[PDB]
mmCIF file of C-alpha atoms and ligand atoms in Angstrom:
data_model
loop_
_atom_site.group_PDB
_atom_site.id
_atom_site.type_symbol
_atom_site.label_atom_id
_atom_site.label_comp_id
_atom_site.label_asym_id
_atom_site.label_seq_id
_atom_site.Cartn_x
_atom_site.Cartn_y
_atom_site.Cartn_z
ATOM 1 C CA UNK A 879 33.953 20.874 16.014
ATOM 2 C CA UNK A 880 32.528 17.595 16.543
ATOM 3 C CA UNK A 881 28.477 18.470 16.012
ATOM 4 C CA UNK A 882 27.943 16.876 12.766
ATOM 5 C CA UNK A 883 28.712 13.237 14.238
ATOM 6 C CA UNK A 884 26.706 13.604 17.539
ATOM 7 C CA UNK A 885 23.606 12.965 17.778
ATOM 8 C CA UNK A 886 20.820 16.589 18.469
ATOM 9 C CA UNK A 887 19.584 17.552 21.594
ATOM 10 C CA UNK A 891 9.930 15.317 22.520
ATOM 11 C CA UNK A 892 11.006 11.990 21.285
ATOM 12 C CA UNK A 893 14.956 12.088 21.323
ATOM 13 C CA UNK A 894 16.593 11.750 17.954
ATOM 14 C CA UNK A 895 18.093 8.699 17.103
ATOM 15 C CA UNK A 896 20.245 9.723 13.725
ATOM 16 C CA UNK A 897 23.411 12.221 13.676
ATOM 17 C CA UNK A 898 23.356 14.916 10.820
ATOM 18 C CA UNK A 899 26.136 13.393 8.334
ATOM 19 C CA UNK A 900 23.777 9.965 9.022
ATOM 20 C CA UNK A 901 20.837 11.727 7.628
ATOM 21 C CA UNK A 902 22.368 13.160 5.043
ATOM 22 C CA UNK A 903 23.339 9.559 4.125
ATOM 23 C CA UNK A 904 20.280 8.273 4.349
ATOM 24 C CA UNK A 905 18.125 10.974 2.368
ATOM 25 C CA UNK A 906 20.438 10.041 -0.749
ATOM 26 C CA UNK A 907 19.270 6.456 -0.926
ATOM 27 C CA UNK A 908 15.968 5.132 -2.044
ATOM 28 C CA UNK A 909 14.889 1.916 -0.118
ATOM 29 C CA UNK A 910 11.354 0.941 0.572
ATOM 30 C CA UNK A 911 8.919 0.733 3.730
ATOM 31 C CA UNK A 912 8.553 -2.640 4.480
ATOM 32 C CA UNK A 913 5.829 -1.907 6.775
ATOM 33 C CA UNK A 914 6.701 -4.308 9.747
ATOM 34 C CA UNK A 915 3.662 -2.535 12.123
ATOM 35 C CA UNK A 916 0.695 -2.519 9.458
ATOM 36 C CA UNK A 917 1.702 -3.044 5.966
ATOM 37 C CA UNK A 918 -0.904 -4.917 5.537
ATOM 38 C CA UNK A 919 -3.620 -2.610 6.045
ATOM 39 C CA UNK A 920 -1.781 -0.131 4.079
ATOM 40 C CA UNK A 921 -1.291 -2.203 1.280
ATOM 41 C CA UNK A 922 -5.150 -3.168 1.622
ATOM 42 C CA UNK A 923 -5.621 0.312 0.580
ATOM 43 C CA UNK A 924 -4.803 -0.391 -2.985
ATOM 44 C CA UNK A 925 -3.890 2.638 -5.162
ATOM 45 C CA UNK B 586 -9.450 -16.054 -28.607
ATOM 46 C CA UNK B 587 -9.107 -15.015 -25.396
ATOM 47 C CA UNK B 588 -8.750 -11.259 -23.748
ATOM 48 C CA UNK B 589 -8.966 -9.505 -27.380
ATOM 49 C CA UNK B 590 -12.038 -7.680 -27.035
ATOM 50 C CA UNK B 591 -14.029 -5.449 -24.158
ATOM 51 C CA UNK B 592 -17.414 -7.899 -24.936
ATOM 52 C CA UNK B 593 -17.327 -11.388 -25.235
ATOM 53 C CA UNK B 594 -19.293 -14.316 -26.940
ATOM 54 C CA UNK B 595 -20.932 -16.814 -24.188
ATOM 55 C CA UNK B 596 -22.914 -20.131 -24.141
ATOM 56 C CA UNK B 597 -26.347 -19.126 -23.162
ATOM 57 C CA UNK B 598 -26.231 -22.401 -20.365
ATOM 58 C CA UNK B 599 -22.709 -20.540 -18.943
ATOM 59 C CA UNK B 600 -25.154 -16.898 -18.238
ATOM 60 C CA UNK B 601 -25.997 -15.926 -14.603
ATOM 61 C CA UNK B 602 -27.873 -13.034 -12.867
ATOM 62 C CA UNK B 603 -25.772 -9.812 -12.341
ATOM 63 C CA UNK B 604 -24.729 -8.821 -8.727
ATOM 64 C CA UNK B 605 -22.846 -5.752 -6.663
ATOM 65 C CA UNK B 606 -19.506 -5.237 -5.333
ATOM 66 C CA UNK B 607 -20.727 -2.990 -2.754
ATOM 67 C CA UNK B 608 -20.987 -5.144 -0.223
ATOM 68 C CA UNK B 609 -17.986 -7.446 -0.839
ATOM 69 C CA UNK B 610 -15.394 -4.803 -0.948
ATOM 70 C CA UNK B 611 -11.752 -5.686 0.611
ATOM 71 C CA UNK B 612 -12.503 -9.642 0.656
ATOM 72 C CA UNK B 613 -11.884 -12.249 -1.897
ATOM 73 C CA UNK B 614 -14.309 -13.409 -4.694
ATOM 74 C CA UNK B 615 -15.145 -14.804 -7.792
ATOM 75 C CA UNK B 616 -15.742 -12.796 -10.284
ATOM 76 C CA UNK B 617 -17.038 -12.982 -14.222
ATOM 77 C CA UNK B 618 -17.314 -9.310 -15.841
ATOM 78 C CA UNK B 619 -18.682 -9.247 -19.059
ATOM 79 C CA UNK B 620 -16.772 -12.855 -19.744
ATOM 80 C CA UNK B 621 -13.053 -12.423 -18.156
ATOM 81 C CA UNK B 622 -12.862 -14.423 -15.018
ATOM 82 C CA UNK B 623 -10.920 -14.647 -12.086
ATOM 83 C CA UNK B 624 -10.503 -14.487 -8.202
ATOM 84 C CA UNK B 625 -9.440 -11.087 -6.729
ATOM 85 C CA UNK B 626 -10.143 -8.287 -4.315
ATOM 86 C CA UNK B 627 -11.528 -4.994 -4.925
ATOM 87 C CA UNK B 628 -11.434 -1.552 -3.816
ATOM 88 C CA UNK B 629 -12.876 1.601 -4.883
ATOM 89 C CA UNK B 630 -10.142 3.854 -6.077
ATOM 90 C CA UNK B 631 -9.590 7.140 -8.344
ATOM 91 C CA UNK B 632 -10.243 6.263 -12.224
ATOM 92 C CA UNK B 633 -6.989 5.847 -14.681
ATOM 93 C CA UNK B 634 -6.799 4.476 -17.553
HETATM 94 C C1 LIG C 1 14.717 0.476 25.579
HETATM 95 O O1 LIG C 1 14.644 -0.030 24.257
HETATM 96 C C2 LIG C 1 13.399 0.230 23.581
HETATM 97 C C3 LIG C 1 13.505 -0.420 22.226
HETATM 98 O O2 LIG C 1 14.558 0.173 21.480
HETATM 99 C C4 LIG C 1 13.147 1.730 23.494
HETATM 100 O O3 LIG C 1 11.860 1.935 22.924
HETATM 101 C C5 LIG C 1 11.729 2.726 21.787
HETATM 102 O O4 LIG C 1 11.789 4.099 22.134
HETATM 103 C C6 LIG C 1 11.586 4.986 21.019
HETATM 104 C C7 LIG C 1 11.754 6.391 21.540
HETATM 105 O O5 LIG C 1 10.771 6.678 22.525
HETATM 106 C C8 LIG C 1 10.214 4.747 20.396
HETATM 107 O O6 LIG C 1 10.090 5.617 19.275
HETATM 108 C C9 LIG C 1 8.864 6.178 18.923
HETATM 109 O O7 LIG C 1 8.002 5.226 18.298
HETATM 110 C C10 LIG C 1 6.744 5.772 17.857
HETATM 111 C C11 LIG C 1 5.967 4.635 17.245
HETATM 112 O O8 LIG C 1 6.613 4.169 16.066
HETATM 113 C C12 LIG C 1 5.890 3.185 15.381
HETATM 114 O O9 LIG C 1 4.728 3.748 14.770
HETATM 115 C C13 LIG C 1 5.002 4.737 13.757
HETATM 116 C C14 LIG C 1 3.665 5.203 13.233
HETATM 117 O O10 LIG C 1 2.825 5.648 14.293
HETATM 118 C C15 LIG C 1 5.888 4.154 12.664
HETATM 119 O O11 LIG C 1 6.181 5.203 11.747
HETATM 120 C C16 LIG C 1 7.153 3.564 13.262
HETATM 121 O O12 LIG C 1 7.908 2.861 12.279
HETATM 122 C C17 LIG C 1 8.755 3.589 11.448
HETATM 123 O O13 LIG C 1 9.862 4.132 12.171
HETATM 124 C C18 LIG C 1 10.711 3.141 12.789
HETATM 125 C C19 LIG C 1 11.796 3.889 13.526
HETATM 126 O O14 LIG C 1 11.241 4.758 14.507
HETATM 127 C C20 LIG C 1 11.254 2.197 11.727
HETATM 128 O O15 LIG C 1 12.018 1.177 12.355
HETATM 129 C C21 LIG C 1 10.112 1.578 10.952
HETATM 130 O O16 LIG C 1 10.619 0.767 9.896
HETATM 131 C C22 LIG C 1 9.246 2.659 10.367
HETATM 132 O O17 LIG C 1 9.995 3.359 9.379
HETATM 133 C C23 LIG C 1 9.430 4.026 8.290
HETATM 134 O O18 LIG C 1 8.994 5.338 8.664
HETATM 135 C C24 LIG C 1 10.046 6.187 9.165
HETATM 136 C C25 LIG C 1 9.403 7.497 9.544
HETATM 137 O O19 LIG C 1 8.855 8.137 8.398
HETATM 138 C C26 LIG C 1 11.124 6.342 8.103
HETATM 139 O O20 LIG C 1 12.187 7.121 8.637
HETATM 140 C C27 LIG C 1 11.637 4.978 7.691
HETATM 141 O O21 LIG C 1 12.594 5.110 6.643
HETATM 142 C C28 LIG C 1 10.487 4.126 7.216
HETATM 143 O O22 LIG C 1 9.920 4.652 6.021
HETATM 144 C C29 LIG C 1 6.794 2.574 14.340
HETATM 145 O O23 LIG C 1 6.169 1.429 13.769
HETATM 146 C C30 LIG C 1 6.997 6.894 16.864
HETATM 147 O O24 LIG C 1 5.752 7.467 16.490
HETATM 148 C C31 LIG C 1 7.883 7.949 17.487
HETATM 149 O O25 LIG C 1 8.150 8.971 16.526
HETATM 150 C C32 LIG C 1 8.566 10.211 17.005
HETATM 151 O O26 LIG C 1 9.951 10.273 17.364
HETATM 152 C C33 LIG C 1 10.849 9.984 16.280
HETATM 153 C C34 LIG C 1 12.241 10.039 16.854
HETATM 154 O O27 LIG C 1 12.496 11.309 17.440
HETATM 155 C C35 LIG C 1 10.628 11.002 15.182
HETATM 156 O O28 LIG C 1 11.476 10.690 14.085
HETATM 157 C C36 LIG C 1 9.177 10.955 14.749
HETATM 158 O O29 LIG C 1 8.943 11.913 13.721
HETATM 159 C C37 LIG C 1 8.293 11.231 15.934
HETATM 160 O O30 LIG C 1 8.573 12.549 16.401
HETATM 161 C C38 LIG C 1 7.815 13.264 17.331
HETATM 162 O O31 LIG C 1 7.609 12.545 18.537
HETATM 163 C C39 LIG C 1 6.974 13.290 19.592
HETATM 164 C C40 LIG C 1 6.843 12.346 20.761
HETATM 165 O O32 LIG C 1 6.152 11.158 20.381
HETATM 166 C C41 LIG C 1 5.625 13.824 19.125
HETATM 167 O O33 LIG C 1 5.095 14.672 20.140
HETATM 168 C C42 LIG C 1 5.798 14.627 17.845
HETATM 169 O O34 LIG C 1 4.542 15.060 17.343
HETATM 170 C C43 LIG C 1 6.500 13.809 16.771
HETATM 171 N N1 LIG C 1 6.630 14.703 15.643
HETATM 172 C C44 LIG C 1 7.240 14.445 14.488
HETATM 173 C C45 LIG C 1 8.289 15.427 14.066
HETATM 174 O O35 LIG C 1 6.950 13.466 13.809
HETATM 175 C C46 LIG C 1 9.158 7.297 17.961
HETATM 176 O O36 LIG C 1 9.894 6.792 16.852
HETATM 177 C C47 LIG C 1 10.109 3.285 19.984
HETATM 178 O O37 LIG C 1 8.830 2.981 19.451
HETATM 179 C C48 LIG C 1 10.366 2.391 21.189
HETATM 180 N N2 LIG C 1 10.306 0.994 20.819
HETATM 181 C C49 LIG C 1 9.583 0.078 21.466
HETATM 182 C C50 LIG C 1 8.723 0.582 22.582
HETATM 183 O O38 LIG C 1 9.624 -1.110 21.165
HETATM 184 C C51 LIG C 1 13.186 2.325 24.892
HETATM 185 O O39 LIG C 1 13.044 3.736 24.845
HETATM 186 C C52 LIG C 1 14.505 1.988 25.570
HETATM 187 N N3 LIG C 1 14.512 2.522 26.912
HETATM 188 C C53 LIG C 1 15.479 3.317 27.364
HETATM 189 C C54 LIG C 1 15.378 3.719 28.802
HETATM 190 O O40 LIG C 1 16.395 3.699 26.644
HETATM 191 C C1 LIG C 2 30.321 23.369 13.608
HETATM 192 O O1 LIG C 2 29.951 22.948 12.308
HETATM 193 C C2 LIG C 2 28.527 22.964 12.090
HETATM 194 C C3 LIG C 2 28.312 22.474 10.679
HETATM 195 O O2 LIG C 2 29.038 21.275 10.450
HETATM 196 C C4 LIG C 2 27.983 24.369 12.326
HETATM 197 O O3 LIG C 2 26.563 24.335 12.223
HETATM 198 C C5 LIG C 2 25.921 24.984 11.171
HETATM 199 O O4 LIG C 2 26.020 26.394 11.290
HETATM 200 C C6 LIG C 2 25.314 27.123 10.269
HETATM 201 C C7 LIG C 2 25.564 28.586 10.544
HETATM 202 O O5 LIG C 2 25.133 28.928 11.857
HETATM 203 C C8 LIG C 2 23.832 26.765 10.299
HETATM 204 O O6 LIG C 2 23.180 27.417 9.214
HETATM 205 C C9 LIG C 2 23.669 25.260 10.151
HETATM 206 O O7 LIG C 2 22.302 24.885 10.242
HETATM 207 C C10 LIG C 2 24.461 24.540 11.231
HETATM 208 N N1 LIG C 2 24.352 23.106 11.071
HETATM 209 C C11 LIG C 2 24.008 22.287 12.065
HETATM 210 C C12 LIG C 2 23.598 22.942 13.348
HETATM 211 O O8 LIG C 2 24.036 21.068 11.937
HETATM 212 C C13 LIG C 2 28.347 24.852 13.721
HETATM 213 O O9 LIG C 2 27.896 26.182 13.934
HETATM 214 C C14 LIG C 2 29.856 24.790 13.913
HETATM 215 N N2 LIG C 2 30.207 25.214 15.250
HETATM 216 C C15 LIG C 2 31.121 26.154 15.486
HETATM 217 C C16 LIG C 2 31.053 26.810 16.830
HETATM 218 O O10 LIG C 2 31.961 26.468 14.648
HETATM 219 C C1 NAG C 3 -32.474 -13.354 -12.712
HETATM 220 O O1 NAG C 3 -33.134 -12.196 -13.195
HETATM 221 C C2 NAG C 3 -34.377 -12.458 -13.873
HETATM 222 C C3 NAG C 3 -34.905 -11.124 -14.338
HETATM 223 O O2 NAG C 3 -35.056 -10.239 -13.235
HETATM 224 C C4 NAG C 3 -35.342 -13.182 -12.943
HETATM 225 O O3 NAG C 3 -36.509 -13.532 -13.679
HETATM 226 C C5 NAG C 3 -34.689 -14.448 -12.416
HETATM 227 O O4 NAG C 3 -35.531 -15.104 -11.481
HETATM 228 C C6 NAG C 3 -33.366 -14.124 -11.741
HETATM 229 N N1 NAG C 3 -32.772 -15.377 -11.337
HETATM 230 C C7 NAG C 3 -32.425 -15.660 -10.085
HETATM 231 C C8 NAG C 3 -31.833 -17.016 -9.862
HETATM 232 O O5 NAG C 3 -32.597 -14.862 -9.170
HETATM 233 C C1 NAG C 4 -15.857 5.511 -5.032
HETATM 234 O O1 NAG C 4 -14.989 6.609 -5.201
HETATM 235 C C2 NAG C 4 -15.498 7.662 -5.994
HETATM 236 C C3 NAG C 4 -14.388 8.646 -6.309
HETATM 237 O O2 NAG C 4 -13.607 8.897 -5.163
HETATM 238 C C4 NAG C 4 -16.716 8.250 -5.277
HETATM 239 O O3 NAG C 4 -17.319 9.285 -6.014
HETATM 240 C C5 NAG C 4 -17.746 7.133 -5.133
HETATM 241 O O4 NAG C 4 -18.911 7.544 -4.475
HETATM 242 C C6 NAG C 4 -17.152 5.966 -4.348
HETATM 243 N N1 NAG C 4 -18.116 4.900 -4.280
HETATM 244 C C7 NAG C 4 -18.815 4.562 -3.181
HETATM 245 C C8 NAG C 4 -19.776 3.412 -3.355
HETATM 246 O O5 NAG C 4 -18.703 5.133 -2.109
#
């Protein structure tokens, strides 16, 4: 039973399941490489 | 002192007629509220604090 490496069968997915479960454990920040800026613009 | 107080004490020569934000919001100005000074850019936002 392979499924948990391969990636799911919209948009098409681009993350296997054991690679999200990776990545839902770790806190790292947008860096906002589209619009940041305009986001950060509104302040909060 | 400086930044010890909410009011401040001023030379009459340094006072200047009061204007709005309203119209300047999301662009850089100078700014002098109640005698703390500064550049910066505002925004109208939820109150804390
Ligand atoms: C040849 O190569 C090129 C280049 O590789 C290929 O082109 C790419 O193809 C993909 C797939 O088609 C394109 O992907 C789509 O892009 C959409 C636009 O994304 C931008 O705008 C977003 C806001 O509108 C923004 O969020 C996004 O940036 C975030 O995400 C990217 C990764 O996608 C990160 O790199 C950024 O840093 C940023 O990340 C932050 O946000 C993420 C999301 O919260 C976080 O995970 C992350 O940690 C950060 O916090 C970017 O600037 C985008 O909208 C599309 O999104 C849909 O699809 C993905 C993947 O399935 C889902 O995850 C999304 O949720 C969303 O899903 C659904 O999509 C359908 C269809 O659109 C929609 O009907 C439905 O309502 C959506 N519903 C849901 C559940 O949300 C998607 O990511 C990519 O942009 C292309 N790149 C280009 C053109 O340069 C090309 O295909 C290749 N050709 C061949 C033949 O292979
Ligand atoms: C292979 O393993 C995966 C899990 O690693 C199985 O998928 C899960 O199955 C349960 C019970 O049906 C679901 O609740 C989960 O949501 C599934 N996880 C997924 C789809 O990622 C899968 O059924 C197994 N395959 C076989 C035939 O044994
Ligand atoms: C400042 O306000 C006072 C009182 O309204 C007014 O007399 C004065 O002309 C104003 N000064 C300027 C430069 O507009
Ligand atoms: C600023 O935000 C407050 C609270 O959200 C709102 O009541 C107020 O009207 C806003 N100010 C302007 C000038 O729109």
């Amino acid at each position: 039973n392979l499924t948990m490496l391969q990636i799911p069968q919209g948009e098409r997915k681009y993350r296997s399941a054991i690679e999200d479960l990776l990545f839902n454990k770790v806190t790292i920040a947008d860096p906002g490489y589209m619009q940041g800026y305009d986001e950060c613009m509104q302040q909060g | 002192q400086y930044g010890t107080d909410t009011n401040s004490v001023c030379p009459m020569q340094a006072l200047r007629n009061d204007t709005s934000i309203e119209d300047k919001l999301d662009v850089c100005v100078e700014y002098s509220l109640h005698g703390i000074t500064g550049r910066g850019v505002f925004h109208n936002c939820t109150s804390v604090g």
